[PDB]
Design a protein around this nucleic acid. Structure first.
Ligand SMILES: [Mg+2]
Ligand SMILES: [Zn+2]
Ligand SMILES: [Zn+2]
Lengths: 73, 1335, 99
DNA sequence: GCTTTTGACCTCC
RNA sequence: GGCUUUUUUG
DNA sequence: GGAGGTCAAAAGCGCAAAAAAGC
């Protein structure tokens, strides 16, 4: 579980962009496929995405390059 | 989906296009059957079907007949929702005038046709004739006639002139009036006429004419021809129990108007005599008037309830109208209510929730999860198993609510902390459990206050709540940097009782290995909770490069402090937990953690503090008893002495040697002194006690009495209440304000006889009444602040301007009210901070200030700094990111897209509840003496007399900072020279307060020149004084031949020459005013500026009046232009004054009453914006003369003065934002190359943006002047007519927008809230950037 | 008491009020200001359009939740359309514009 | 009833 | 399901 | 003759709740 997002909002510029990117990542996680990169501990889709933000491995740039590579079929 | 909203007048053509039929039957339904009446107000043919996909005839049914008209009923087969859209029209038999356009505050028809409003109503109501075309007669085209005049003119002229009646005549004359010809005639007229009264009216008329010219509307459309009908479903005939039906006011008025139309159209067919048709048409006009607006013209239509019926205008305006009740705020689903109850075992980021509420709220979520696990297949089956409360239901509910945050609010939601997110945890019972620490933020106590819960649905909402509105992310208030998680009450008492040594206790004087061992002793009962010992402790410091270093030693502390030391994290030093640890200390300690350890450690530490405090307060068992109220022993006898005192003073009144006021003040002072003595004695007796030490001697320690512990720690109460318990209650007041001479000598511990209790209730009733009636006024004020400031969002990083305002510590002449530190903290420097050493850069330009830069200023002792401010930022439709400064919530620079206007409005409006409606100079501290804005002379006695109005005192410290500032009248006495190292507690200035002097200019000899005796001056040797002196006669005896004779006391030397002052040599005669007595005589020596004559002479409403920029009842007039004072042709009822510039012309004139005080004479040089009379200073003049940067400093100072008087801390950043929203409009001065009229009033930002490219090209700019508007009026005058319409005066704003054909852009916050789209703020700001990029 | 989805008022299509009528609470105007003070825009947009009166869209919200998918459709509040017609019921012409 | 504000009529210079 | 009237709590 | 003075009319005056009645 997670209680605060101070470190995550430190990793990204401001809180609003963090909310937007976390929402997009959670939507990808939940609607279909996209196995999360960090092991789960029986948590909801929203928080598990947010953790990936504070690991420094998901952001606006990293998330965008992946999807265009998926859509090029 | 839609770019913008367009509003304009209607046309009979578009009204006919809207409608699908015409209505002719006033009846609605059969009332026998439940079927709609054909051709009535619910006609199935006109509007639509009743049952979905079922025509009235019933011949065609189901989807197969969709889009097909039935043969006999003729009702298309489609869904029933169309009943909400299709409209009807009624063909009026005669034209009818629209009420709104006729009866606004300015009448549209009145100014368009250029007639007084009274005549138009007479014409419409058929009580007076009117000409429609004069022709070749002796009658004007727009002349008003009556019966007798026209009947005489009927046979005098006949068909030569044309005159008619009613709305038909009004429409005929309106259509006959040309528009461009009128516009060009006005254009010719304005440049010719020279009269201010004509200017404004003519400008308004020409502006309205141009508005009709540019807009695609025509004036004749203003008179209704076909009346639209509201769709049926919006005015429903809902059935109740029984055959009766519920009818709305709309149906009744529509039925009345349609029935009257039918009657008049039937009566007109038979050509009834004109007497009949006049009354019928007039009263039909009354019916339509009542339909569109009830009660505007006169007596209102009333029903069986005897109260006025609702109308269309009544259903839009007001709190019960459409806007404020169903668009800005609307009831929601997924919500619940409950009663609050404290829970100590919860962590900071979570709250309780009853099982039933959780189940009811998350029922939609449970259905899905049951389907996923396969426990039930159909939704009906899942609903069946939910209501049974099966064992699986609770398990699945627990699984689905692990991290689903919920919202908590408590009405009223004063500040933005009123709504907070939480993570629910399931509990039993039927009450909502809440964490104690946050109870201070809600201002919620556990005396029956109720909470409401709402539940977010989408992932965006959940993440938004978790990252923004969670409790752990709200620890610094937006109003000011002070923390908002301060522990209070029970916890504070526990911590205080923990850390307090006793001179002797069990197990005192031993040595302990560590805190872990110390806890073992206390639990075993082998040592007292507080007894001084020596313990080994280990503390860590982050003094290295972000790394912790360990150190170990022995400290002399108590057992309890060692127990408390476990929960403190690594970074903090040990000295922070070694004092008594009251309320004020503990919060400070907590705050230090947030300064060093970030956020997670500080929230964990706060939670641990609350746990430990509750536990050790419970184990303490601190209780209050009757014996705890220690009544001082001396108290009794002291009262006797006081009695003896008054026993003498009353005798003085019996002897007549003292008056009523003298005795009153004497007894008041004596009783106050007795009260102070009793209070001091009581505190001194209570606060200390004796207990035997280790060697058997008495030793005084701080007392362990329960009341003293609960008072000193600050947990609850203050010294005033402890006074109220033991010592006397004190002086009490009458309702009006007078103080009762006899005080209440008794305290609450002992009895109060009857009358003492009675007189004690005078104050309490006043307090309750003020508290009850302050919440109505204050909250409303907050609303007015929000609508003014709801358009402010940060949009750009840097504006790129150097303009700013200087910031100085505010001083009244005593101690600094606010030092330089806090006012400038968290802003940006407009210019580089320069060292007192010349040409040294202490602070680079465009650098944020924080703790690391502020302390640099303190060490360097800088005087003042000019910082960038929001009121001067240049970006249009927004605020520069740097200009706003540092965001107070997070502590770093503000980020784009945050709503600052609403935050400032909430911050300033929240503390309003804590407000209530109802001769010599002495230095105090050591320092130098320094004078600026001063010019004076050295008198004969050797001292200095001042002749400069702007003289201000300073007390320079050891380094150069200013400590105090005073205002002194001219012609005072300066015992010391400037620049001398003066000592404190020594008077410096002296003057006469009750008289104003006529002091001379320089050293010279007075010669009796140009005084006329007997009409201007007389030798009034009054017998009460026996002194002969020259006394100027009054203004009554003197007349035009005597008032024009001004006594000119010319100051001359021995040779009789004029004043040889440096630079100029004007003859310095002094025109003496009336009632002036000249004690000095001719030939008497005059010092340097010696006297010649001595002439004789708050709360929330204040804040509200200050913000509205109300003109004060006694406006202190100012100067207008720089130049020398020059009198004029006076005594023309008022006075005349002229200012003569050095080179410029001097045509300015203004009226001044004689009876008001005058402070400036001929022999003074006045700068623009200098006071002439006395009193309050109106904001409009301050803006007009001294500029923008003066008015913004005045308002901020006054508001902050009120707040600091009431002890409320609010940052000055929020105050000035509203000021920026008051200076929105501006008035053109000269058009130049622009395309604006001189008399127009347009937006300052609009002028700046339009003019900016004009100056960029080969053109010249347009001169303008910024104007100030009250918040109430400034809110009304905005471009976005939706927001203005929603706020106040709905009728005026809609009509003004419709007449001008204005168009909305939908760029604000409120107007975006109305139509359901994302607001351009916060998270939604990124979306609008994407949207704006596409267009 | 608490409400998930119950009755609806006939005119403005907002949920009823009062415990006896099994209605939801009132997201007051002051609450709208306070929720505006945060950066929280999506939650306010929810409160305005989906949970209150978007009769075409709020049904799709219920079906999405049961399916496990948490997503909305903005739509446009139904209470605003009423006022439009009402202003058109006078002599004032008010209309939207192109996309 | 409070209070403000704005418009309109009288009238004093 | 709208209005009116009070009463009560915060 | 008009710019100033004085009198008359419109518009607003917390928010949540609950409870009842009555229309
Ligand atoms: Mg309470
Ligand atoms: Zn039919
Ligand atoms: Zn700026």
């Amino acid at each position: 579980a997670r209680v605060t997002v101070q470190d995550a909002v430190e990793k990204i510029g401001n809180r609003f962009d963090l909310v937007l990117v976390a929402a997009r990542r959670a939507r990808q996680m939940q609607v279909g496929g996209k196995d999360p990169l960090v092991p789960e501990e029986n948590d909801k889709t929203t928080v598990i995405a947010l953790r990936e933000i504070e690991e420094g491995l998901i952001n606006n740039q990293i998330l965008d390059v992946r999807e265009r590579q998926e859509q090029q079929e | 989906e839609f770019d913008a909203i367009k509003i304009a007048l209607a046309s009979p053509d578009m009204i006919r296009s809207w409608s699908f039929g015409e209505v002719k039957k006033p009846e609605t339904i059969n009332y026998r059957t439940f079927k709609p009446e054909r051709d009535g107000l619910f006609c199935a043919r006109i509007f639509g079907p009743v049952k979905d996909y079922e025509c009235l005839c019933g011949k065609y049914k189901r989807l197969k007949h969709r889009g097909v008209i039935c043969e006999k009923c003729g009702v298309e087969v489609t869904q029933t929702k169309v009943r909400r859209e299709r409209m009807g029209h009624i063909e009026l038999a005669s034209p009818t005038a629209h009420i709104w356009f006729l009866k606004s505050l300015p009448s549209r028809i009145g100014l368009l046709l250029d007639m007084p409003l009274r005549d138009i109503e007479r014409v419409l109501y058929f009580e007076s004739y009117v000409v429609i075309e004069g022709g070749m007669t002796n009658l004007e085209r727009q002349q008003i006639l009556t019966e007798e005049q026209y009947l005489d003119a009927l046979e005098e002229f006949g068909d030569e002139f044309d005159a008619k009646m009613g709305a038909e005549a009004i429409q005929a004359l309106l259509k006959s009036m040309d528009l461009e010809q009128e516009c060009e005639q006005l254009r010719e007229e304005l440049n010719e006429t020279n009269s201010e009264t004509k200017r404004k009216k003519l400008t308004k008329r020409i502006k309205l004419l141009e508005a009709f010219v540019q807009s695609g509307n025509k004036p004749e459309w203003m008179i209704l021809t076909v009346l639209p009908v509201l769709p049926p479903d919006l005015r429903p005939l809902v059935p109740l129990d029984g055959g009766r039906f519920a009818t709305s006011d709309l149906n009744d008025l529509y039925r009345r108007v349609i029935n009257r139309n039918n009657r008049l159209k039937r009566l007109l067919d038979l050509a009834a005599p004109d007497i009949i048709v006049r009354n019928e048409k007039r009263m039909l006009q009354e019916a339509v008037d009542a339909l569109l607006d009830n009660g505007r013209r006169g007596r209102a239509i009333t029903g069986s309830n005897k109260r006025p019926l609702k109308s269309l205008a009544d259903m839009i305006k007001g709190k019960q109208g459409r806007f404020r009740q169903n668009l800005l705020g609307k009831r929601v689903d997924y919500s619940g209510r409950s009663v609050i109850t404290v829970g100590p075992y919860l962590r900071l980021h979570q709250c309780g929730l009853p099982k039933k509420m959780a189940l009811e709220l998350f029922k939609p979520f449970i259905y899905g999860k049951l389907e996923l696990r396969g426990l039930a297949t159909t939704i009906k089956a899942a609903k069946k198993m939910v209501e049974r409360e099966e064992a699986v239901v609770w398990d699945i509910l627990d699984e689905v609510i692990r991290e689903h945050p919920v919202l908590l609010n408590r009405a009223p939601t004063l500040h933005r902390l009123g709504i907070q997110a939480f993570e629910p945890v399931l509990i039993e019972g039927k009450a909502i459990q809440l964490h104690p620490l946050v109870c201070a933020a809600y201002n919620a106590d556990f005396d029956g206050d109720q909470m409401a819960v709402h539940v977010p649905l989408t992932l965006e909402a959940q993440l938004e709540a978790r990252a923004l509105m969670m409790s752990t992310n709200n620890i610094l208030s937006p109003a000011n940097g002070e923390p908002i998680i301060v522990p209070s009450q029970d916890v504070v008492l526990g911590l205080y009782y923990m850390t307090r040594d006793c001179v002797n206790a069990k197990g005192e004087g031993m040595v302990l290995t560590g805190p872990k061992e110390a806890e073992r002793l206390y639990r075993s009962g082998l040592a007292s909770l507080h007894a001084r010992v020596k313990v080994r402790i280990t503390e860590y410091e982050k003094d290295a490069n972000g790394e912790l270093v360990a150190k170990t030693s022995l400290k002399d502390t108590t057992v309890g402090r060692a127990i408390l030391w476990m929960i403190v994290p690594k970074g903090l030093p040990y000295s922070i937990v070694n004092q008594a640890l009251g309320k004020k200390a503990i919060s400070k300690m907590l705050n230090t953690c947030y300064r060093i350890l970030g956020l997670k450690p500080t929230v964990i530490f706060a939670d641990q503090i609350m746990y430990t405090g509750f536990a050790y307060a419970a184990r303490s068992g601190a209780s209050v008893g009757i014996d705890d109220m220690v009544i001082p022993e001396k108290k009794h006898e002291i009262i006797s002495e006081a009695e003896a005192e008054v026993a003498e003073i009353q005798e003085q009144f019996q002897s007549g040697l003292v008056t009523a006021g003298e005795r009153y003040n004497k007894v008041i002072d004596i009783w106050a002194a007795a009260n102070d003595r009793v209070s001091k004695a009581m505190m001194d007796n209570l606060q200390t006690e004796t207990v035997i030490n280790r060697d058997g001697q008495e030793e005084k320690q701080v007392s362990f009495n329960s009341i003293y512990m609960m008072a000193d720690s600050g947990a609850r109460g203050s010294a005033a209440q402890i006074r109220q318990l033991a010592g006397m209650r004190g002086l009490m007041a009458k309702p009006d304000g007078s103080i009762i001479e006899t005080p209440i000598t008794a305290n609450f511990r002992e009895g109060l006889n009857v009358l003492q209790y009675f007189i004690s209730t005078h104050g309490a009733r006043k307090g309750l009444a003020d508290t009850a009636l302050k919440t109505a006024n204050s909250g409303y004020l907050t609303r007015r602040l929000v609508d003014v400031a709801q358009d402010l969002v940060v949009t750009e990083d840097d504006c790129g301007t150097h303009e700013g305002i200087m910031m100085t510590p505010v001083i009244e002449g005593g101690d600094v009210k606010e030092p330089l530190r806090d006012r400038v903290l968290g802003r940006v420097t407009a210019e580089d901070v320069l060292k007192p050493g010349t040409a040294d850069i202490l602070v680079p330009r465009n650098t944020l200030l924080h703790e690391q830069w502020c302390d640099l200023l303190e060490e360097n002792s800088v005087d003042a700094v000019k910082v960038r401010s929001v009121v001067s930022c240049d970006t249009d439709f927004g605020v520069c990111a740097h200009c706003y400064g540092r965001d107070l919530a997070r502590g770093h620079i503000i980020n784009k897209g945050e709503a600052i206007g609403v935050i400032a409005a909430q911050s300033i409006g929240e503390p309003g509840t804590q407000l209530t409606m109802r001769s010599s100079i002495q230095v105090k501290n050591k320092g130098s003496i320094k004078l600026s804005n001063v010019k004076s002379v050295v008198n004969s006695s050797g001292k200095l007399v001042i002749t400069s109005r702007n003289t201000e005192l300073k007390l320079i410290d050891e380094f150069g900072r200013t400590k105090e500032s005073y205002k002194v009248p001219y012609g005072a006495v300066l015992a010391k020279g400037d620049g001398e190292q003066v000592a404190g507690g020594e008077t410096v200035a002296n003057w006469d307060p009750h008289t104003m002097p006529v002091i001379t200019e320089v050293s010279g000899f007075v010669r009796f020149t140009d005084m006329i005796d007997g009409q201007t001056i007389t030798r009034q040797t009054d017998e009460l004084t026996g002194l002969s002196s020259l006394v100027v006669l009054d203004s009554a005896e003197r007349t035009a031949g005597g008032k024009d004779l001004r006594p000119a006391l010319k100051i001359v030397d021995a040779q009789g020459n004029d004043v040889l002052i440096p630079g100029t040599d004007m003859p310095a005669q002094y025109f003496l005013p009336g009632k002036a007595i000249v004690q000095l005589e001719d030939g008497v020596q005059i010092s340097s500026g010696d006297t010649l004559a001595r002439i004789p002479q708050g709360g929330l409403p204040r804040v509200a009046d200050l913000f509205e920029a109300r003109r004060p009842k006694e406006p202190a007039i100012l100067a207008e232009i720089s130049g020398i004072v020059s009198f004029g042709k006076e005594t023309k009822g008022k006075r005349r004054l002229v200012i003569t510039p050095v080179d410029g012309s001097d045509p300015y004139e203004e009226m001044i009453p004689k009876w008001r005080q005058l402070n400036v004479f001929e022999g003074e040089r006045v700068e623009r914006g200098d006071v002439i009379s006395d009193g309050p200073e109106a904001p409009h003049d301050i803006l007009r003369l001294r500029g923008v940067h003066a008015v913004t400093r005045y308002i901020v100072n006054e508001v902050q003065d009120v707040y600091r008087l009431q002890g409320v801390k609010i940052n000055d950043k929020h105050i000035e934002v509203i000021v920026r929203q008051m200076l929105r409009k501006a008035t053109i001065v000269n058009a130049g190359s622009s395309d604006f009229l001189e008399g127009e009033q347009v937006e300052y930002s609009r002028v700046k943006i339009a003019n900016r490219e004009l100056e960029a090209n080969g053109k010249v700019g347009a001169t303008y002047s910024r104007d100030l508007l009250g918040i109430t009026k400034a809110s009304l005058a905005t471009e976005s007519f939706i927001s203005a319409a929603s706020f106040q005066e709905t009728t005026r704003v809609l009509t003004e927008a419709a007449v001008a054909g204005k168009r909305d852009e939908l760029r604000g916050l409120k107007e975006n809230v109305i139509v359901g789209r994302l607001i351009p703020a916060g998270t939604g700001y990124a979306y609008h950037q994407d949207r704006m990029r596409r267009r | 008491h608490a409400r998930s989805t119950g009755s609806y008022s006939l005119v403005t299509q907002q949920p009823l009020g009062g415990k006896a009528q099994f209605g939801g609470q009132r997201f007051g105007e002051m609450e709208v200001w306070a929720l505006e003070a945060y950066g929280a825009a999506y939650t306010l947009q929810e409160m305005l359009t989906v949970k209150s009166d978007d009769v075409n869209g709020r049904t799709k919200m219920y079906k999405n939740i049961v399916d496990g998918n948490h997503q909305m459709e903005p739509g446009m509040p139904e209470s605003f359309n009423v006022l439009l017609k009402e202003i058109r019921s006078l002599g004032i012409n008010i209309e939207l514009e192109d996309e």
